[PDB]
Amino acid sequence: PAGRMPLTVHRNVGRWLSEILHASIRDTGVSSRIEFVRRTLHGWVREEYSETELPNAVYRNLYFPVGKIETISECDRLKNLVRNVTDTLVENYPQGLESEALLIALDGVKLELARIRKDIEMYGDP
Amino acid sequence: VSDRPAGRMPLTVHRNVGRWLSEILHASIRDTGVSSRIEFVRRTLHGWVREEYSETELPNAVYRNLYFPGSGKIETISECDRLKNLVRNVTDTLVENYPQGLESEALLIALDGVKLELARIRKDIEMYGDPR
Ligand SMILES: [Cl-]
């Protein structure tokens, strides 16, 4: 059994992932990992809920409700959003290769935000 | 077990990838951003290979040994280079055998993260390590 997150929680996670994407269009290390997490979760939520509880029309609009990271404030804001998503996944899904894949991808987002922040601090403006 | 990519690797190729992952792991098991990603890839492939090969092609005793199987820390430029090449070998082999999809994408991401970590460690060695 895969485990399950409530629909309201999926909704919150989808919103946070979209916010990170909107901020990272020009940072493909970040965006490609977020897209992976989003596409994975879009797949899972369909499996966790019947068509009766979650109609196609409502489903197809939950993770896909139808850009350069260059400031410290932006690294911090994104790190916080990543923490929100990671904490939520850890709270709701069992330890296993399925969830590990997402947690590793989210950690790699943090590795990118860390590299960016470091570059700003050393080579950017006071 | 039924969930894996729509393709397969030759047994000799699995063995090579196993060897490369083990070598990376032996050299970096104290670099947790590298080792945790490598362990994920090893564990994943270990599950897949069992379904790709029958018990007569790959007996249980042979199977157990395929993926399973110094300071343990990356501290030289030489090691960064070696590991970067082993990572490249693994990544190149995966794309040669498994089609694009979420299943293999998880692996390719983890392996890209290893490269992100090698890069950070390399920069630390260059700036803060021995200038001669
Ligand atoms: Cl990663």
Q: Give me ligand 1 centre to Cα A4, in Å.
A: 24
φ/ψ region of A3 (left if φ > 0, alpha if ψ in -120 to 50, else beta) reads left
The residue extents of the domains of chain A are 6-121
Q: Which two tokens stand for residue A6?
A: 């409530």
Query: Do residues B47 and B4 lie in contact, with contact meaning Cβ atoms separated by under 8 Å?
Result: yes
Rg, C-alpha atoms of chain B: 16
In order of A35, A98, B11, the CA distances from A2 in angstroms are 21, 8, 30
CATH 1.20.1260.40 fits B10-126, yes or no: yes
Method underlying the structure: X-ray
- Cβ of A104 within 8 Å of Cβ of B120? The answer is no
- Biggest CA-to-CA distance, chain B: 56
Query: Do residues A102 and A40 lie in contact, with contact meaning Cβ atoms separated by under 8 Å?
Result: yes
Long-range contacts of A96-100 (CB under 8 A, 24+ apart): A97/B40, A97/B43, A97/B44, A97/B47, A98/A2, A99/A3, A100/B40
Residue for token digits 């935000």? A113
Query: Spelled out in words, what is the top-level CATH class assigned to the domain A6-121?
Result: mainly alpha
The helix or strand, by DSSP H or E, that contains position A97, with its residue range, turns out to be helix A97-123
Find chain B residues with C-beta within 8 A of A39's C-beta: 102
Q: Which two tokens stand for residue A52?
A: 């009766």
Q: Give me ligand 1 centre to Cα A110, in Å.
A: 9
Residue of B nearest to A44 (CA): B102
Residue for token digits 């050299």? B27
What does residue A60 show for φ and ψ, rounded to 5 degrees? -65, 5
